[PDB]
Design a protein around this ligand. Structure first.
Ligand code: NI
Ligand code: NI
Ligand code: NI
Lengths: 118, 128
């Protein structure tokens, strides 16, 4: 048994993918369009889906936004240098919280940066 | 880089832990009370935190429940037998919102479980 992925709904897939590939070093593992359901799925990550947990991004073409609650916490990512990754995301124009840093993606989801070791 | 974990706030940590450890066969990797912040956290998974992504569960002492939005999707888990996991969660009293269905090639064997807080757990059968 193993954890395969966590899924999040996004209002703009291309903005979501820019954050996960520019502010973070994720690779597009697979993307799939379903016109019959008017949505697109994209899997982003590091290793192959067969080898590690990925992030699933759902984009329902008809939704302008999603009401995030206070139940969902965050997605934690292991980084080499927390301050650097945080500075790079700040420089790209992304929101940052003001060894451990917090970013938020274009939809408002929180990403926890944890420096390898700790 | 690598994904370490996903975090969810639970109204009752004991109820949440019983579902993940009993219905889903996860092990308790970490648990700590923080009286200074009035919260407790727990880490559940299948492998060591150094090797794989885990699930972090938080319970804030001053809360009796959480407003779950429509943004968060689900946590997906790989299972040997989705029919068996469904029957097992149901035998313990948990809700299966979508049964696995007849196991056959090349049908996608996917099931949906609901945890005690109403979070969605997607069960994908190994081999699909
Ligand atoms: Ni859109
Ligand atoms: Ni965390
Ligand atoms: Ni999924």
């Amino acid at each position: 048994m193993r954890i395969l992925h966590s899924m999040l709904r996004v209002a703009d897939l291309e903005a979501a993918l820019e954050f996960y590939t520019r502010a973070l070093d994720m690779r597009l593992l697979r993307r799939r369009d379903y016109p019959e359901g008017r949505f697109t799925l994209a899997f982003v990550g590091y290793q192959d889906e067969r080898a590690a947990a990925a992030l699933e991004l759902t984009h329902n073409w008809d939704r302008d936004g999603y009401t995030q609650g206070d139940g969902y916490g965050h997605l934690a990512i292991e980084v080499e240098d927390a301050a650097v990754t945080c500075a790079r995301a700040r420089a790209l124009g992304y929101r940052v919280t003001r060894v451990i840093a917090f970013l938020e993606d274009p939809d408002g989801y929180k990403v926890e940066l944890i420096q390898k070791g700790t």
